Design an enzyme around this catalytic site. Structure first.
Site, PDB file in Angstrom:
ATOM      1  N   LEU A  52      20.968  13.310 -44.163  1.00  0.00           N
ATOM      2  CA  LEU A  52      20.627  12.384 -44.902  1.00  0.00           C
ATOM      3  C   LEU A  52      19.000  12.411 -45.259  1.00  0.00           C
ATOM      4  O   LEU A  52      18.329  13.275 -44.549  1.00  0.00           O
ATOM      5  CB  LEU A  52      20.713  10.805 -43.879  1.00  0.00           C
ATOM      6  CG  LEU A  52      22.073  10.431 -43.573  1.00  0.00           C
ATOM      7  CD1 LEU A  52      22.031   9.197 -42.704  1.00  0.00           C
ATOM      8  CD2 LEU A  52      23.005  10.368 -45.009  1.00  0.00           C
ATOM      9  N   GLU A 100      20.927   0.375 -40.034  1.00  0.00           N
ATOM     10  CA  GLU A 100      21.686   0.391 -41.298  1.00  0.00           C
ATOM     11  C   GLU A 100      23.294   0.989 -41.003  1.00  0.00           C
ATOM     12  O   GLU A 100      24.383   0.533 -41.452  1.00  0.00           O
ATOM     13  CB  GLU A 100      21.019   1.267 -42.195  1.00  0.00           C
ATOM     14  CG  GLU A 100      21.503   1.087 -43.614  1.00  0.00           C
ATOM     15  CD  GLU A 100      22.850   1.740 -43.855  1.00  0.00           C
ATOM     16  OE1 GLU A 100      23.626   1.129 -44.707  1.00  0.00           O
ATOM     17  OE2 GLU A 100      23.176   2.864 -43.536  1.00  0.00           O
TER      18      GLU A 100
HETATM   19  N1  NDP Z   1      23.818   8.068 -47.846  1.00  0.00           N
HETATM   20  C1  NDP Z   1      25.215   7.909 -47.852  1.00  0.00           C
HETATM   21  O1  NDP Z   1      25.621   6.856 -47.808  1.00  0.00           O
HETATM   22  C2  NDP Z   1      25.882   9.171 -47.615  1.00  0.00           C
HETATM   23  C3  NDP Z   1      25.213  10.429 -47.508  1.00  0.00           C
HETATM   24  N2  NDP Z   1      26.096  11.618 -47.249  1.00  0.00           N
HETATM   25  C4  NDP Z   1      25.230  12.808 -47.461  1.00  0.00           C
HETATM   26  O2  NDP Z   1      26.004  13.637 -48.650  1.00  0.00           O
HETATM   27  C5  NDP Z   1      26.046  15.006 -48.510  1.00  0.00           C
HETATM   28  C6  NDP Z   1      27.508  15.448 -48.217  1.00  0.00           C
HETATM   29  O3  NDP Z   1      28.165  14.945 -49.573  1.00  0.00           O
HETATM   30  P1  NDP Z   1      28.456  16.073 -50.704  1.00  0.00           P
HETATM   31  O4  NDP Z   1      27.630  17.085 -50.631  1.00  0.00           O
HETATM   32  O5  NDP Z   1      28.654  15.183 -52.155  1.00  0.00           O
HETATM   33  O6  NDP Z   1      30.116  16.538 -50.336  1.00  0.00           O
HETATM   34  P2  NDP Z   1      31.303  15.792 -50.027  1.00  0.00           P
HETATM   35  O7  NDP Z   1      31.423  15.019 -48.722  1.00  0.00           O
HETATM   36  O8  NDP Z   1      31.937  15.044 -51.421  1.00  0.00           O
HETATM   37  O9  NDP Z   1      32.130  17.180 -49.854  1.00  0.00           O
HETATM   38  C7  NDP Z   1      32.347  18.000 -51.030  1.00  0.00           C
HETATM   39  C8  NDP Z   1      33.796  18.593 -50.853  1.00  0.00           C
HETATM   40  O10 NDP Z   1      34.726  17.602 -50.137  1.00  0.00           O
HETATM   41  C9  NDP Z   1      35.860  18.125 -50.842  1.00  0.00           C
HETATM   42  N3  NDP Z   1      36.337  17.379 -51.957  1.00  0.00           N
HETATM   43  C10 NDP Z   1      35.740  16.378 -52.531  1.00  0.00           C
HETATM   44  N4  NDP Z   1      36.194  15.785 -53.596  1.00  0.00           N
HETATM   45  C11 NDP Z   1      37.557  16.196 -53.475  1.00  0.00           C
HETATM   46  C12 NDP Z   1      38.671  16.188 -54.217  1.00  0.00           C
HETATM   47  N5  NDP Z   1      38.770  14.999 -55.367  1.00  0.00           N
HETATM   48  N6  NDP Z   1      39.947  16.618 -53.908  1.00  0.00           N
HETATM   49  C13 NDP Z   1      39.805  17.344 -53.056  1.00  0.00           C
HETATM   50  N7  NDP Z   1      38.775  17.821 -52.365  1.00  0.00           N
HETATM   51  C14 NDP Z   1      37.625  17.258 -52.588  1.00  0.00           C
HETATM   52  C15 NDP Z   1      35.526  19.533 -50.628  1.00  0.00           C
HETATM   53  O11 NDP Z   1      36.507  20.370 -50.739  1.00  0.00           O
HETATM   54  P3  NDP Z   1      36.540  21.940 -50.173  1.00  0.00           P
HETATM   55  O12 NDP Z   1      36.664  22.095 -48.753  1.00  0.00           O
HETATM   56  O13 NDP Z   1      37.562  22.078 -51.162  1.00  0.00           O
HETATM   57  O14 NDP Z   1      35.330  22.807 -50.728  1.00  0.00           O
HETATM   58  C16 NDP Z   1      34.296  19.593 -51.651  1.00  0.00           C
HETATM   59  O15 NDP Z   1      33.557  20.725 -51.649  1.00  0.00           O
HETATM   60  C17 NDP Z   1      25.524  15.307 -46.976  1.00  0.00           C
HETATM   61  O16 NDP Z   1      24.161  15.490 -47.568  1.00  0.00           O
HETATM   62  C18 NDP Z   1      25.537  13.882 -46.289  1.00  0.00           C
HETATM   63  O17 NDP Z   1      24.665  13.715 -45.351  1.00  0.00           O
HETATM   64  C19 NDP Z   1      27.688  11.381 -47.514  1.00  0.00           C
HETATM   65  C20 NDP Z   1      28.153  10.202 -47.250  1.00  0.00           C
HETATM   66  C21 NDP Z   1      27.382   9.055 -47.492  1.00  0.00           C
END
Ligand code: NDP
Length: 186
Positions: free
Chosen positions: A22, A30
């Site tokens: 984060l 939160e």
């Molecule tokens: N502040 C908040 O509310 C939140 C913050 N976060 C933060 O966000 C970051 C992580 O998020 P982010 O980097 O966007 O990555 P995601 O959690 O979206 O993960 C990305 C990966 O998820 C798979 N994926 C995503 N979309 C699809 C789909 N449509 N179909 C199949 N597979 C999919 C992965 O597959 P693969 O194995 O195929 O590479 C892709 O590389 C971290 O920094 C975390 O701390 C996360 C949630 C909430």
């Protein structure tokens, strides 16, 4: 088991993530709101279900996986088997949403929560039909890697109130924030 509820905490610059963690220091208060909203089903005997990207899943401390008392689905195009602790693996959001509507899960699943992935949020918000956005506005800028999609106010109504959601400004460790709920029907 059919409206899609995205839940996110976002900085003023729309940041959600930084180096796989984060952008802000832990906001335990939160996170309590996140736990309560995602975990509380409207029906005894059913669990809520969370869908997340693979990066978000491995970003959750292991001591906190799976998200307890929720059905956990992880999206990955490369994993062949669900991560240890995860209930289901799906190769697409479409596969996940089809699974959730199967009759074998009806008795089992109440609300569906999208809990991140930037691209997971993006895809969820592309869906036709009933969406809610549960958005924590962190009223400060933080250095960020990954971001929440724009919220089109022509598409999403800001609800003046929502059951079980307090609207007053909150603060923790000198960081101010507030809970908002948006809705797109149809
Ligand atoms: N502040 C908040 O509310 C939140 C913050 N976060 C933060 O966000 C970051 C992580 O998020 P982010 O980097 O966007 O990555 P995601 O959690 O979206 O993960 C990305 C990966 O998820 C798979 N994926 C995503 N979309 C699809 C789909 N449509 N179909 C199949 N597979 C999919 C992965 O597959 P693969 O194995 O195929 O590479 C892709 O590389 C971290 O920094 C975390 O701390 C996360 C949630 C909430």
């Amino acid at each position: 088991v059919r409206p899609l509820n995205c839940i996110v905490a976002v900085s003023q610059n729309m940041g959600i993530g930084k180096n796989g963690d984060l952008p802000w220091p832990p906001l335990r208060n939160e996170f309590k709101y996140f736990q309560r909203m995602t975990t509380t089903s409207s029906v005894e005997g059913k669990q809520n279900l969370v869908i997340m990207g693979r990066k978000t899943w491995f970003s959750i401390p292991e001591k906190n996986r799976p998200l307890k008392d929720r059905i956990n689905i992880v999206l990955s195009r490369e994993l062949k088997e669900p991560p240890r602790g995860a209930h289901f693996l799906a190769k697409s959001l479409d596969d996940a949403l089809r699974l959730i509507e199967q009759p074998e899960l009806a008795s089992k699943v109440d609300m569906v929560w999208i809990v991140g992935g930037s691209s997971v949020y993006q895809e969820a918000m592309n869906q036709p039909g009933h969406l809610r956005l549960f958005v924590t506005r962190i009223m400060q800028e933080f250095e960020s890697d990954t971001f929440f999609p724009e919220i089109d106010l022509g598409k999403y109504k800001l609800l003046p109130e929502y059951p079980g959601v307090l609207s007053e400004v909150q603060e923790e460790k000198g960081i101010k924030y507030k809970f908002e709920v948006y809705e797109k029907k149809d």
